[PDB]
Amino acid sequence: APVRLGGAKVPHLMPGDSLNLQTAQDTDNGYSVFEQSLLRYIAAGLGVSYEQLS
Amino acid sequence: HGGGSGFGGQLRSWNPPSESVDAALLPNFTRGNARADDLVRNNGYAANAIQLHQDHIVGSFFRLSHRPSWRYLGIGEEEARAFSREVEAAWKEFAEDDCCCIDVERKRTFTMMIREGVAMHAFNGELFVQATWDTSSSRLFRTQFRMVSPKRISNPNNTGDSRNCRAGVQINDSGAALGYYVSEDGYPGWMPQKWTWIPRELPGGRASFIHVFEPVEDGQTRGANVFYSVMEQMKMLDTLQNTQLQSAIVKAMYAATIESELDTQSAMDFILGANSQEYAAAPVRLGGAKVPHLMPGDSLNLQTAQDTDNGYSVFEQSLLRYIAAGLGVSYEQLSRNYAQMSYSTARASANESWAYFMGRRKFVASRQASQMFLCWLEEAIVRRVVTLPSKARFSFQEARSAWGNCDWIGSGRMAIDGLKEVQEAVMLIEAGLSTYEKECAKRGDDYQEIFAQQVRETMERRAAGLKPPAWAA
Amino acid sequence: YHGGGSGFGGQLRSWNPPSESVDAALLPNFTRGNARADDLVRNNGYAANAIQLHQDHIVGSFFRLSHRPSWRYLGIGEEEARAFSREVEAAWKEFAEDDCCCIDVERKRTFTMMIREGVAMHAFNGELFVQATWDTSSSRLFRTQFRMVSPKRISNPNNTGDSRNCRAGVQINDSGAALGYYVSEDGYPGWMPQKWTWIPRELPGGRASFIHVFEPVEDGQTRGANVFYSVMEQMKMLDTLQNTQLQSAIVKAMYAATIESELDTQSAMDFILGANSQEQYAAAPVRLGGAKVPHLMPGDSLNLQTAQDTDNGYSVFEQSLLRYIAAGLGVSYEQLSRNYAQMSYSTARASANESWAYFMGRRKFVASRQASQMFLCWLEEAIVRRVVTLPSKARFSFQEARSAWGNCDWIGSGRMAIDGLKEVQEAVMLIEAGLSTYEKECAKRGDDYQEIFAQQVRETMERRAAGLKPPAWAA
Amino acid sequence: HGGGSGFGGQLRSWNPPSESVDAALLPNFTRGNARADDLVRNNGYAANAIQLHQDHIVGSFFRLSHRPSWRYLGIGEEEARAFSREVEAAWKEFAEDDCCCIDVERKRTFTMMIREGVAMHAFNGELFVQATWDTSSSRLFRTQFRMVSPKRISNPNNTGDSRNCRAGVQINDSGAALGYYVSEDGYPGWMPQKWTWIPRELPGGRASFIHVFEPVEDGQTRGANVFYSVMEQMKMLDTLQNTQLQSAIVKAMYAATIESELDTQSAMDFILGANSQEYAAAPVRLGGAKVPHLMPGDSLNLQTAQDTDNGYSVFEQSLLRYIAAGLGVSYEQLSRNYAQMSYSTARASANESWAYFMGRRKFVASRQASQMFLCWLEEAIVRRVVTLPSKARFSFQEARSAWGNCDWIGSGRMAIDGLKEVQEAVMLIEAGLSTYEKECAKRGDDYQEIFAQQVRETMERRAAGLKPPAWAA
Amino acid sequence: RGNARADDLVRNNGYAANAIQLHQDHIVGSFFRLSHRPSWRYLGIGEEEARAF
């Protein structure tokens, strides 16, 4: 079943129910910084300056 | 390689059905433009977006300069510029007339015609202007121009689409348009909608109906509004904005809470002050610190709530930037956010957007206005309003584009600094590289009357006998 | 395309807005929209400030006419027209900014106020209605007077429906041009009925009986739309959020502490708070002394709740919304929000010019038209009374050359400089380079070169008569 | 679309009762001014805001310069100059009269009456002043004045408001005011308040009573205070400041707690030193460490309390900006917070507020002063204070506006820097762009007497013989 | 298939639409003026005819 997007719609879940919201995690937990190291390394291979490449 | 399947399957089931843009958008073209009206008339950003277009590619005024092909006609520039003078004044008199006589609706002036058209073109993909010939002989010029909403053009009687008629647009084998089936107004839904076929061009040669747009690829008919790339995101952004604001309300609203086995009315009396001593449960005065004496067993709680903006502003940043890319307009102009910007960088943002705007001005504003202009010339010359030189190698209809070759002046690029901007402009003509004509066109005026006005001032000041201005002898 | 139809996996499958003209999309509940807009500008601080920004910047304080007839097109030497225009300007000057206050029928405002009134109501109601009339009493030299009319006044008679020609009290021909208007009289007492009245748009002689000005978005639109109509819901939602959050902090900071005694309230507060020694429900107020360390038995506790932050991200969230607000109203954000912090000179200069340019386009498309509309109507009577004589050798008469005779432009409050010294440096050097004229410079400063020159020569000989020193303009 | 119902209902029950401005203002008109007086009399921000007006709208003085329409009246140039200075001298002598007898109350001078005018128009939305002619001719001018509070102007006997009698304002058919019903002071509530009908205009061509206010739209009869968009929120702000202050007291007031089965009095002696040797419980001397010897079952818990400004400060200026938005005043002036302000940022905010003040001066301060001016001038001519030119095309009553045309000079813009302001001023005038009158008026002075004073200066110096000043030859 | 996917991105994505818009506005700009420079030396023609022509 689909659900229509609307207001807050606070529910009245019975005892023994739960409405856990998954907080997930930082989508870029260092990945950008890790690319910085890799991009510099690959820049050395191609000789072209890293900032031009990235 | 990349187009085949994608790494690890991934896009195993993404098979866009390659087809012409005509087949791409015509089935939902009316449906698409309907959503365009909604966003432009209900979201602030869209309203700002179109507003920014009107005030840049058009601006407050839209001046005209006529450049007939005297060399291509073999006419001396002396009489050529002599001839081009009065018509400009004649057009100027006919252009900014207060009566709004140039439109049948009699509720708009020439400048806003372009402004609405480019706006109409912006948020709908195209614009339509229809030429008329009113019978009111009192006016020297007996023609008027009115725009038409694109939704007013469609197949008569909702006819299924065919090769030569598409959305009520008559097209020949080659691809040119010939006629338009346009419906009338439909504000009262009680009466049925009739239809009217209008030829694109009068067989005589005078323009009857002008449709201006930009075809992305060849053989198409209707221009698609710019929002077709950002419609999905922008609408959901608004919904998120409203929902996020609503959540803050309710979460902040329920501030405290109290629990007890005691009576509900009694609890407020002994905890939250209450006024039951004298439907709505109990109003409570706001006074001092008002420390209670909750009995052991019950308690009072103050909800800590939650951060009202848990990075939501950052999410707006990215989403607005995405929207700005689709719209072409710079981000800081769209969101009116100018944080942590250097002068050099601030120039670049406006620098590229201005280049984008000037492209649209030539390709939309200039074309439609010039297409409007020569039609007015046609009436003027046939009504003997102005006189052509005797040396004319060709007839007016023969060299109509050559005769009516004209360029337009819009509102100038207001400088972020100006002082350097004027300084560089001054030293440029000092270097002799530039000319008065283009620099004043950049600012928003024409050198000719500027020279006359300066001539006007210097004689007046010398007549006034105070001091000659900075142009003497 | 693809985004038009159904989007990403159903997504906006329920978004199928109807397609129709703006009149069909605005007229049905058009009255309610004005009511919503009216309340916001009446009660929300930002909205009142927003419209105030329009009034004080689109026109500002003064509004000066400049009549520049097309002498070449009129078959008249500019020397006659220049002399002629000077006469009419003073007569207009004698008529427009006069302390007579008789420009309006109710005699309450002055000319500059009329435009300021008009632009404001046009801003938050979409359009302006001004009535042009005549005075039977020849007491005044000019019998014409004006009267602004609320757009709410303009309405269909007997609150009936609308036809192909009848639309919200406006009668239109096939082309949609307005010809007839219906105005109901004021109904301030809540009992007596309102009475309508049909008014022609213009008199057959070319006189504008009733002037209506707005900015339609598409052909056929009869009534303009208020600028708020895109962002009104945010204001109300922002309004309640501000009040609720402010209210919430009151209660969160209300109850500072609590006591967990087993005894009665009186005994508890006496032994934990103090008070007592009563002089003669009301519980007991406690003197605010110092420290007052109490003693406790087991089973009783004095707990001071820490509450929570009163601005836990509220301001920044509002900071975002106000940015969205300024986009809808087309005004510089920091100006609307009065939040002029953390921006450099370039950044500050960027926003200010951007909005100011929007005002200038708005000023030309509204203020210039409305002032000119009134000016020609007054001019009609002015020459009818022949207070100023038209040039004898005119190629055309006045009636056909209405715009040519009445060709005029207007100047309001100038672009007040952010820096000043830089800006004055601009004008002086470009004039030294000869890239502009005194007219533009004076107009950009909200002035006219004529009297400035007249004052300049006047101040010259005055000191010269005083024998003090020749100013920087001699011989 | 947006105005219909709202997304997800939302504003499904927001239905303002569309009405005329008076139809909403009049029913609660007294209550509006009631709360306005309370806020200005009790709230510092309200007091500061109002105080910010009379010293900026008009400053500490109000110069007058009468400019008759000599060209329109066809009068000689210098003759008009001769007339203007005589009446100016006559006016200025009477305007700042140290008698304080200009007003019947004899408790205010002309300048502060103008300040009284603008301030009253600020927090009450309107301005009143009664023109009277005194019988006692002890002095040259019999025309006194008295501003009347709006609270003294209302419908007589609290009768039902009518079509032509709204809020004690006699209204003609066209909507213009004809007369007013003024109630005398009712300082003791024991006695009733009678009513006097005052004509708006004396039949002789004299403004018997002068009412100044700004109408939002047509049909207005009274003026709405600027606070109308700011009352409730700032009142809730007012109690919040008090409420947190009291809460901060008690939270910081209670410091330590003692629990022990021992008798409380002995607990104080054994633990907190006490003075048991010599009801106010038991005081404690303030000395050194006072390390105790708590037995098992006892403790000396110290209350860490809680931060006294947990976001309250940063919550303030967010509201105060909203407050300052309502009153139009710049935020930093109202809040007296001036941090994080660069030179350009300071320039902009002061500039923005300044223009609005200049507008407010023109529409209120100049209006009231002009109305006071010609009324006095009317007495001046009838008393032959100044002799009119013979060749007057029309008499004074016919050309009151022409005779009485004038401007006013308030206090100047307090320059933040001054140097460049003077530096731009000197380069502006030398360029010929401006005139000496302009800037000195912007400074707040008149060019005429400065020329005379400098002329006085140079001859005084020459007589003393020290050095020719910078005006010689 | 490749053009089909390539078409869709420029047809329904803001960034892609921005890219091609940047292409047109920068690669060619608003005006595309032409000059004719025949090689009169190779043509063995007097330059005066060539530039006049």
UniProtKB/Swiss-Prot annotation, chains B, D:
GO molecular function terms noted in the UniProt entry: DNA binding; structural molecule activity
KW Endoplasmic reticulum (keyword) present: no
InterPro entries found in the cross-reference section: Phage_lambda_portal
Post-translational modification: Proteolytically cleaved by the viral protease during capsid maturation.
Main location: virion
GO cellular component, one term: viral portal complex
Taxonomy, superkingdom: Viruses
Keyword line: Capsid protein, DNA-binding, Viral capsid assembly, Viral genome ejection through host cell envelope, Viral genome packaging, Viral long flexible tail ejection system, Viral penetration into host cytoplasm, Viral release from host cell, Virion, Virus entry into host cell
Biological processes, Gene Ontology terms: symbiont genome ejection through host cell envelope, long flexible tail mechanism; virion assembly
Cellular localization per UniProt: Virion
Function noted in UniProt: Forms the portal vertex of the capsid. This portal plays critical roles in head assembly, genome packaging, neck/tail attachment, and genome ejection. The portal protein multimerizes as a single ring-shaped homododecamer arranged around a central channel. Binds to the terminase subunits to form the packaging machine.
Family as reported in the entry's similarity comment: Belongs to the siphoviridae portal protein family.
Subunit structure: Homododecamer. Interacts with the terminase complex composed of two small and one large terminase subunits.
Name by which UniProt lists this protein: Portal protein B
Lineage: Viruses, Duplodnaviria, Heunggongvirae, Uroviricota, Caudoviricetes
Swiss-Prot record, chain E:
Superkingdom of this protein's organism: Viruses
PTM notes: Proteolytically cleaved by the viral protease during capsid maturation.
Protein localization: Virion
Subunit note: Homododecamer. Interacts with the terminase complex composed of two small and one large terminase subunits.
Recorded family membership: Belongs to the siphoviridae portal protein family.
Function: Forms the portal vertex of the capsid. This portal plays critical roles in head assembly, genome packaging, neck/tail attachment, and genome ejection. The portal protein multimerizes as a single ring-shaped homododecamer arranged around a central channel. Binds to the terminase subunits to form the packaging machine.
Protein name per UniProt: Portal protein B
Source lineage: Viruses, Duplodnaviria, Heunggongvirae, Uroviricota, Caudoviricetes
Gene behind the chain: B
Location of this fragment in the whole protein: 55 to 107 of 533
